[PDB]
Amino acid sequence: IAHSMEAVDEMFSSSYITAIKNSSVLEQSFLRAILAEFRRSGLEEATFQQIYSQHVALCRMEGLPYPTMSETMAVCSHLGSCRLLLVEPSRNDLLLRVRLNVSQDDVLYALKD
Amino acid sequence: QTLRNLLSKVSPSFSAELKQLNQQYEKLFHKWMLQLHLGFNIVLYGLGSKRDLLERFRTTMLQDSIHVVINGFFPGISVKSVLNSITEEVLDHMILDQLDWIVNKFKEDSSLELFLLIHNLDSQMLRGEKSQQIIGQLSSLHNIYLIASIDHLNAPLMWDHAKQSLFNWLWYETTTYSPYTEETSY
Amino acid sequence: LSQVQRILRERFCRQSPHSNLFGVQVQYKHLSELLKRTALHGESNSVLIIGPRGSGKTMLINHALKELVLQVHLNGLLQINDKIALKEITRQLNLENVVPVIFILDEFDLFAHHKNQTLLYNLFDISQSAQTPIAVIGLTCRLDILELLEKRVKSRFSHRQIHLMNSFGFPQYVKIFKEQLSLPAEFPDKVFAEKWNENVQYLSEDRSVQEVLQKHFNISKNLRSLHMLLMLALNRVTASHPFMTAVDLMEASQLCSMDSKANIVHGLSVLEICLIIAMKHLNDIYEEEPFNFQMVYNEFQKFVQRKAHSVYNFEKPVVMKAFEHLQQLELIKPMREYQLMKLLLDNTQIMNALQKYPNCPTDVRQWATS
Amino acid sequence: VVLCRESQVSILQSLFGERHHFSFPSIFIYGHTASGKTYVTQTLLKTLELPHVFVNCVECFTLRLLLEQILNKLNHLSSTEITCETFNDFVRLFKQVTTAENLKDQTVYIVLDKAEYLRDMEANLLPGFLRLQELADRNVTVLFLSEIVWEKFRPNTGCFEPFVLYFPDYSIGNLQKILSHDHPPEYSADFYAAYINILLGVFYTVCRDLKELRHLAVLNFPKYCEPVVKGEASERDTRKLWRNIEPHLKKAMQTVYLREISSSQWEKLQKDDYYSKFILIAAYLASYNPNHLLGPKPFPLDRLLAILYSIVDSRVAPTANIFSQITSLVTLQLLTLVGHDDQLDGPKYKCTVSLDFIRAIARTVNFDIIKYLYD
Amino acid sequence: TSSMSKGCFVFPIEDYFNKGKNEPEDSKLRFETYQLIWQQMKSENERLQEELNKNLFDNLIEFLQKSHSGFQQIKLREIPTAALTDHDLTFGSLTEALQNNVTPYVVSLQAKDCPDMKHFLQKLISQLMDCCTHYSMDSLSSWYMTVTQSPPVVVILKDMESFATKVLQDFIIISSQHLHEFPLILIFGIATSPIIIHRLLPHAVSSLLCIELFQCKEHLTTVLDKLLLTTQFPFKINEKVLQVLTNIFLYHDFSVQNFIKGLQLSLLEHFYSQPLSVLCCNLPEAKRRINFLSNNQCENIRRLPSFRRYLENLHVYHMNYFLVLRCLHKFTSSLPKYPLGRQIRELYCTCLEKNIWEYASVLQLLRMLAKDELMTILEKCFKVFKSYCENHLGSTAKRIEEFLAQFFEVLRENVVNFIDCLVREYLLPPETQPLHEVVYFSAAHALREHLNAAPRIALHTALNNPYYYLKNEALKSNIAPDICIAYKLHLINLVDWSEAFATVVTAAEMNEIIHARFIRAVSELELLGFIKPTKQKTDHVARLTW
DNA sequence: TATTTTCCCTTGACTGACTGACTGAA
DNA sequence: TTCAGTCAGTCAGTCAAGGGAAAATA
Ligand SMILES: Nc1ncnc2c1ncn2[C@@H]1O[C@H](COP(=O)(O)OP(=O)(O)OP(O)(O)=S)[C@@H](O)[C@H]1O
Ligand SMILES: Nc1ncnc2c1ncn2[C@@H]1O[C@H](COP(=O)(O)OP(=O)(O)OP(O)(O)=S)[C@@H](O)[C@H]1O
Ligand SMILES: [Mg+2]
Ligand SMILES: [Mg+2]
């Protein structure tokens, strides 16, 4: 029964949660900043500026060094390339709408551990 | 609508008073042709409808000539139709390219003479500037003659200095009181 | 020496195969076992390897193929149309004259963007039904590869998934860094090889090196970035500098993480800086609402007439030209006058960039602060 | 020759290493307009005598032109015609053509400039060029030249990240040293240095572009030698020349800098030492009234006629000529109708003219616009 | 016959020209003379236009010469460009100006067939091949090297304002990079303010181009000096006709076409209404027509009011009057204030209005003039005298020669006396001499109403005061056709308007036909550009407001 | 090159809150 | 002469249709 259970939960389950778990530190901070901004506002779309400000605040809270805009843009591009978000960052830069590609409860369940 | 069209038993109050003006302005037909043959075109602006005057003019004068009439008041006319009538039936041939071909044809031969009658030039179907450009290039030729009429208060806005430079316009105050019975579609 | 430089250039830049593998024991074992099954036997299978870019997806296949007949490699960028793919397949299989085989599909996700996914559907059908043994493995960066496919092609798609994540901690990253910058045992000069290994050993525990490693670990665990870092660091080694030093790694780390927007702003001129300060003021007063050239020009005129010196009395054409120049670098995007312009910068970035500006006067600084 | 460029040059030369060595697949250079991304790399690749193919993205507006020009230049450097249609065919032909002896164990470079257009050509072309060393596997390096930072070249899917590089911002000393080198042999180097110094002091505030600045210097030089030719001033009269030349440069800043006056006319000069107006004024006054910041607004013909009658204290009969004259202006782009609901019934017009032109027009016929424009 | 559910139904010259039984033969002589005169007019006008266009093209050719002088290590060389219905022929002439002089290779392009760079280059290379496959600028350079083995290429963009901005930018950018290997020259056609250029070509792109600008009242002054101020042409006009023509030209539109049109309309009306227009021709033809005249023609000559008061004498009067007026214009234009007038038009108007002797106001400045002005004016007068031969004023030329050769106050006073005696001696109003009305026409209302008619004024007159053309005492301070009743009642919901119209039409007198008349009036009003139905009331529209 | 569909931006009337002139102090 | 309560006259927020150029298809 163990073999069948492993097969069924390895070939059917979604891999978003463990992909979030294995993500880097700055990526986790970016996710936390987006979640906090959404809690403040309640909308499913937000520009890059508010998320960047929330991320600066969270980095100051964590004691991390001051992050530049280009580094945040690179992190966002990497996150988009794996479709964890939805964005069109090719041409517009500071005014990018960012949407969660998965449910918020899954993100919280991944980030609680 | 039909009930109104059927009822036409009314009679004008001043009968002979209006009748005399008809001849008063009919006396100008010879002057009209005198002007028109020498490189001008004639426009009618007045309160009453000129269709009666146009009919009398075509009966009295437009008999021994090649003439084509445009009923611009019809709600379904466009310049393509008049171009088709010119090329297919007036000419024995069997829209910009068509206009170029017609201009070239009349440039080739000066033996063809046409009288272009336009009952209404300011109708909603011919208020476009490009259509007026086409008609101006047509009537700019010395082998086409133009009699036209305008009734809109804001009519002259339709053409500009270049377009009015194309038409060698001549004006004629003809203030009849004829009703617009045929023109009004109700 | 030239030999070690050539060896490392071949190691990092070309990403040539290497014997040492990191945290992929189970995945590579399974992949090579399946390849052996599909080679020694007639069974056909289909596998997708999903991972973030630069995580060494290519290496697994490139090494398990060596663990093992014709192979076909298809990249989504070269063949964009089904006719091109058919031409390449016919030419590579040496059956062009006529008209088990291994299919390798790089950039698999793009193949889901075709008009009918005909190539993928046919490959799935022949894998599932045809007696000829065919093995198909695709490379994937998107985590939603299961939703870009049609229902039927998904039905025939065997759900064999490999996940290449960077599931290793910081001390393991330290071990990886130590091992990656080590000469092998095949080098001609052996005493220098041992001394080089001793030097990299010593560099391993230097805490200023640990600063660089922690920083670039927070940025990106992707090994491609680390290889780029090592190559850039190695570029600063010649005969006069026989060994690498922690200061070199600090220099490389700083050179890898400099912001471009601040540099561009540092590249601007006086009038551009003044216009940007006026732009920041207008954006502050009008919270997140657009503007045009006239309001900015009036604000600038007010500043120069009232607070600034009588010098810098510039007309309208020069300010319009400066606005055109700023629009040319795509720092200002429309939503020519009376046009709803907007800004593409952050306030603190402008402040920091002005902090480094060489010849910034004092009145302009006060205006920026005020 | 390259001046004040020794950091990036040495970095690049170290990057190349040896001919049989391997290098980066993609290096992305970025900077400002005249930063030097083109002269430096061209002089470097000419000095090193390496196989490099120079390509302009503006000229090759089509993919086929780009690939065929690349292939023809490469074949000409190696040494009839090669024509390819897709990227895959170009890759195959490149693998076929690089097998020459002289192109066997050397790095072949594909220099691109004005690459800002590559993002607007096709979706997959840029990733194809980024991963060229993987696909061709023939010791290939490709450079990128741009004025936009790499942040705006990133596709959504992500690709092979090039190594980013910045060419440095210039300075007063660097700019003068670049300028103070190509001196006219007919006068002193100190004279040229002083000329560059005063030119920078006048113009560096806004016009930092080295190309524009050198063009301005070339244009402005002949006026500067007149004081010493006529003998009224000596070569040591710094203050005298400054006073003589400063207003001339200040005026050239207003005129030549915007190129309102053609250079030929500039050099020649220095060597030689009715009812339409009222309709337009009424239109303008009606447009800017119920801020000048928010822009004009459309107005109907009724108010235009009313304003025109009110302004003119004379009997202006509403003839057809004035009606046609109104619409004779909209064809000069000085007006614009909006809505196109009807062509004759109440044509609303919007007046797209500047204030200075209106003021000059009013000055022509002795009328004041200002007194009617504040409310 | 002409009414159905379809919109297109189709059903000697002198006989039309002459309708009165007065004289047909004199009528057909008048018509031929009129046609000959107008042919001469048109020929001379064409000569003037040709001369002006050649004058412009000379300057353009010289500009191109100086531009290509530069083409004869790049050191920042730019692209030479020159900014410049009838236009179709205009540039056509330019072609013959350029092909015969500058280069054998010149092409024209139409914005209708240049949507992208590909079509632009394809058409350009096709035209280049005619003037003798994914082409490029390298293809152009290779072709140029093949054919020339120095002459540049000229491209005519006859409607630059209609091109695509991207195509222009790309073409200029790619062209500037190959000036060393492929010469290019551009000629833009512009019929608007040149500032539009800066709104299409960005300054970054525009920095690559060296632009030159190349091009109304002067035209009219010159043509009127060569039409009416010349003695050769026999027919002339009176004061008011000229005043109306000028006051429409320099007030309504700076167009000379309608001025020439008014000239020919005046000529036609004068030759149509007046039989004695047969009388006036060139002097030999005039006399030979004089010799044989019908009795009724002699009757008409006998009844002329100018004759009741009382040709060669009038003609010599004109030939001396025009020279004296030219001298007066030379005098007036010399003054810095220009009191009498700026152009010859105002000089002739003020000389013809009345006996000029502000006249003393101008003489006041005349009294305080310097010596060099006198010398220059005398030299100009002498060259004017030498310009025209067959002079009846040779003795005056000798006198002014004596005046000038002597070269304080008395001499200037004497020469002022000489010129004042001249202007008193020759210039006069024309109607003072008899038999003027043969040559002259004046029906100001006819021409003025024909050329610049007023539709709105006529409509308002018809709709407000029907008595103006219906002479039955219908108005002197209600009893009018219902059209006027409705229009006046407008200056308005339909129910109240209909009730008021019904009560008014009953006061002026089963009656259901009043409703029918109301409907007809409303419909005919709607057909005119007056009203449009609204929803605030049953209908409330006031487009007129006048 | 010709034909058919979609939501964004313009016009307009319905609706509910707002505030200028008035009064009285200080 | 500017700052507190009143009211009448004012003013902006709010709920719908439809034109029309971009988008899609042949
Ligand atoms: N498990 C591993 N064992 C050994 N080297 C690894 C491992 N994972 C990554 N690498 C290194 O990662 C380097 C870069 O990997 P790449 O081959 O460029 O990535 P990739 O597999 O091609 O992925 P993409 O998305 O196709 S670009 C190689 O030089 C390897 O040495
Ligand atoms: N760093 C430099 N050192 C010396 N001369 C330079 C330098 N940069 C520019 N120049 C000179 O200026 C000219 C024009 O500058 P470019 O080299 O074209 O600058 P660029 O970075 O290529 O910008 P673009 O793409 O040409 S607009 C060159 O031809 C050189 O003569
Ligand atoms: Mg790979
Ligand atoms: Mg360059």
PDB file of N, CA and C and ligand atoms in Angstrom, chain C residues 57-58 106 139 224, chain D residues 134, ligand 3:
ATOM      1  N   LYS C  57      19.597  21.592 -15.350  1.00  0.00           N
ATOM      2  CA  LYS C  57      18.693  20.584 -15.890  1.00  0.00           C
ATOM      3  C   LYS C  57      19.386  19.730 -16.945  1.00  0.00           C
ATOM      4  N   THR C  58      20.177  20.378 -17.804  1.00  0.00           N
ATOM      5  CA  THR C  58      20.813  19.683 -18.919  1.00  0.00           C
ATOM      6  C   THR C  58      21.737  18.573 -18.435  1.00  0.00           C
ATOM      7  N   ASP C 106      14.296  20.167 -25.802  1.00  0.00           N
ATOM      8  CA  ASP C 106      14.590  21.389 -25.070  1.00  0.00           C
ATOM      9  C   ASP C 106      13.502  22.425 -25.325  1.00  0.00           C
ATOM     10  N   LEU C 139      12.271  19.500 -21.108  1.00  0.00           N
ATOM     11  CA  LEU C 139      12.850  20.414 -20.133  1.00  0.00           C
ATOM     12  C   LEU C 139      11.871  21.553 -19.892  1.00  0.00           C
ATOM     13  N   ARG C 224      24.264  28.862 -11.751  1.00  0.00           N
ATOM     14  CA  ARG C 224      24.758  29.645 -12.879  1.00  0.00           C
ATOM     15  C   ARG C 224      25.342  30.970 -12.407  1.00  0.00           C
TER      16      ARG C 224
ATOM     17  N   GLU D 134      25.721  27.530 -26.563  1.00  0.00           N
ATOM     18  CA  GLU D 134      25.200  26.191 -26.309  1.00  0.00           C
ATOM     19  C   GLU D 134      24.787  25.505 -27.605  1.00  0.00           C
TER      20      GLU D 134
HETATM   21 MG    MG H   3      19.841  23.463 -20.878  1.00  0.00          MG
END
